[PDB]
Every structure is written in structure tokens, then in C-alpha cells.
Ligand binder design. Structure first.
Ligand code: NA
Ligand code: NA
Length: 327
DNA sequence: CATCTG
DNA sequence: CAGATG
């Protein structure tokens, strides 16, 4: 956790790089298990050889750990931190819609900057365009004070369109959090479940309203169950308009809301712990259900949940307010 | 994993 | 349809 930090750090720098610049998934994947094991590792890695002793730790990494331990640096890391190419890739990637893949193409075409991009707005697609247009806004966290205001609009509109809708804003917002990166809504309806053959309108009607009133400004991707867009809190009395924010809305069969709701709410750590506890309790959980674990190895049959309560109940545990869902 | 692009 | 992105 702090005993082998540099190591684990350089290891991650390297890994990332393989994957983003080179195309080196194998290698990339290599650096990663390496950082992971050394991570769990209990002592002070004092040399390569000590390290090598670890699974996932080959001669190559070992070599690196040496130079690093030997000198506060690593030539490779040194070289890579300069290379404008590598940098451009790291940068372009920040644009929403531009992945590494794209980042590679663009660079080879000489587009390495924000300006480069605007100039070539033509080579970018819709997402990518939007993503370039709100680059600033997009990196700006979202303060609860706005989140509450956002949440308020969304729920009220959902309600209007159908009294029977059930919306929930998950994420850290849900666990208390002072700010957040984007708004995530879970949506369901009675008339929508496991079996129930579709009802696309279910998502689309809401989306529509949200744009009706102007809350939603752009569409990143609209599917029949997942919406990826942009919204904005109406600028009050002109002087201070709000940054554009990412927002997503997803339709879920009512018969599997809570697990999802539970699930999305995190944190990753709270999940796992519960997940692992579920297991003890003779259960299983995943993003959509909770199944009674047979003994034959495994077994299924989705246990029936009407709230986040039912879930906990099942694994016989303490209902935790979302705030305490930390770890 | 679901959506897009081409 | 593969392949890319979130
Ligand atoms: Na990106
Ligand atoms: Na292939």
C-alpha cells in the first residue's frame, strides 16, 4: 500500500503505456498482474531477484525494478515522458469519444491538439464532436449543490410523464459525496421486466421530456435501454450559465432494479465485501439478481427482491444507509 | 454490455 | 459484420 508504491507505480506507467501507445496488450497485461502481486506483497522489495521470486514476475520486470531501486529513475519512463507522440496520444484520449485507437490515427495524421482537432472537425464523428465542444465542462467535477438541483429536475419530469416510473440517481452522489463526475440515473417501470417483451417507449418518452424542458442538450448515444447524453441546469438570470454535464439514463426491468440500484451505488469495495459475504450466506449476487447457492458447486434461481432491504435481509446483514456503503 | 460507425 | 468507445 506504500511499501512498494514506486514500484507499483512505475509498473502501472509502463503498463499503461504498452496498451495506449504500442498496441502491446500482452505486455500491458503483464505489467498489471505484476503491480498487483507486488501490491499485495508484505515486505520491502529490496531488489529485482527478490521480486522475480514472484509469480507474474519475470526477468524483464525484475530488470526494471533493479534500475529503479538502483536509481530514482527508469530510462524507459524517462524516454516515454518526453516523446511527443506518446504524449499526444495521452492527451487526445481525454476527449470524449476518442479512444487510443483513434488517438493513434489522428496523431499519425498530425492532429495532436485541441486546435488540431477543431480544424479538422470534419474527421470526427458526432460523439467525438460533442466531446470536443465540451472538453472544458467535461472535465469539471459536479458539485452536490448542482447535483441536488439536477436530481430535482429529473425526478419531477419523470414523474410527470408517468407516475409509475421509478427513478434513482446512483453513484457517489447516492453515497453522500461532495461532488461527482457525471449524473447516472437508474430507471424502471412496473410494466417492464425480465419476461415482458420490451417497451422502448419507456426510455424514449422520458428522454424526450428532458429535452422538451431543455434539460438535456445533446445525445451521445440513444439505445433502447441506455441513453448517453448531455444536460444543463438552466442558467438563471443571465450572468452565470452552467457547465455542460454528462448524463446517462438506463431502463431496467422492474424485477431487477434493486440489485442494480444496489450495484451502481457502490462502492466497488462495499460491493465486493457484500458479494463475498453473500457467498458465505449461501448466495450470489451480481448486477441483476441474487441467487440461492446450491451445494453441487453452483446453482441458480433468482430470489425475489422488492427493495435494497430484501437483498441485505437475504444475506442476513445490516441495512446500510448509502452513506456507509463506503467500504 | 450496449451503441455507433463504416 | 468487426472493432471501438464509455
Ligand atoms: Na476519450
Ligand atoms: Na480478430
Amino acid at each position: 500500500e506504500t511499501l512498494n508504491g514506486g514500484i507499483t507505480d512505475m509498473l502501472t506507467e509502463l503498463a499503461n503505456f504498452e496498451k495506449n501507445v504500442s498496441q502491446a496488450i500482452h505486455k500491458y497485461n503483464a505489467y498489471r498482474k505484476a503491480a498487483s502481486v507486488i501490491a499485495k506483497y508484505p515486505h520491502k522489495i529490496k531488489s529485482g531477484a527478490e521480486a522475480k521470486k514472484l509469480p507474474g514476475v519475470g526477468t524483464k520486470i525484475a530488470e526494471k525494478i533493479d534500475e529503479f531501486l538502483a536509481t530514482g529513475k527508469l530510462r524507459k519512463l524517462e524516454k516515454i515522458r518526453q516523446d511527443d507522440t506518446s504524449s499526444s496520444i495521452n492527451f487526445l484520449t481525454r476527449v470524449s469519444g476518442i479512444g487510443p485507437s483513434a488517438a493513434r490515427k489522428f496523431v499519425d495524421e498530425g492532429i495532436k491538439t485541441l486546435e488540431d482537432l477543431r480544424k479538422n472537425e470534419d474527421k470526427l464523428n458526432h460523439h467525438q464532436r460533442i466531446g470536443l465542444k465540451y472538453f472544458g465542462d467535461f472535465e469539471k467535477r459536479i458539485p452536490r449543490e448542482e447535483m441536488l438541483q439536477m436530481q430535482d429536475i429529473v425526478l419531477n419530469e419523470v414523474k410527470k410523464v408517468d407516475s409509475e416510473y421509478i427513478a434513482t440517481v446512483c453513484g457517489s452522489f447516492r453515497r453522500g459525496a461532495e461532488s461527482s463526475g457525471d449524473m447516472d440515473v437508474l430507471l424502471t417501470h412496473p410494466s417492464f421486466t425480465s419476461e415482458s417483451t420490451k417497451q422502448p417507449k419507456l426510455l424514449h418518452q422520458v428522454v424526450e421530456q428532458l429535452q422538451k424542458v431543455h434539460f438535456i442538450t445533446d445525445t451521445l448515444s440513444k439505445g433502447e435501454t441506455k441513453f448517453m447524453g448531455v444536460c444543463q441546469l438552466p442558467s438563471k438570470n443571465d450572468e452565470k450559465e452552467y457547465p455542460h454535464r454528462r448524463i446517462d439514463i438506463r431502463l431496467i426491468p422492474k424485477d431487477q432494479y434493486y440489485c442494480g440500484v444496489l450495484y451502481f451505488t457502490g462502492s466497488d469495495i462495499f460491493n465486493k465485501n457484500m458479494r463475498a459475504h453473500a457467498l458465505e450466506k449461501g448466495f450470489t449476487i451480481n448486477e441483476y439478481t441474487i441467487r440461492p447457492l446450491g451445494v453441487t458447486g453452483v446453482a441458480g434461481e433468482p430470489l425475489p427482491v422488492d427493495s435494497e432491504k430484501d437483498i441485505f435481509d437475504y444475506i442476513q446483514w445490516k441495512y446500510r444507509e448509502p452513506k456507509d456503503r463506503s467500504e
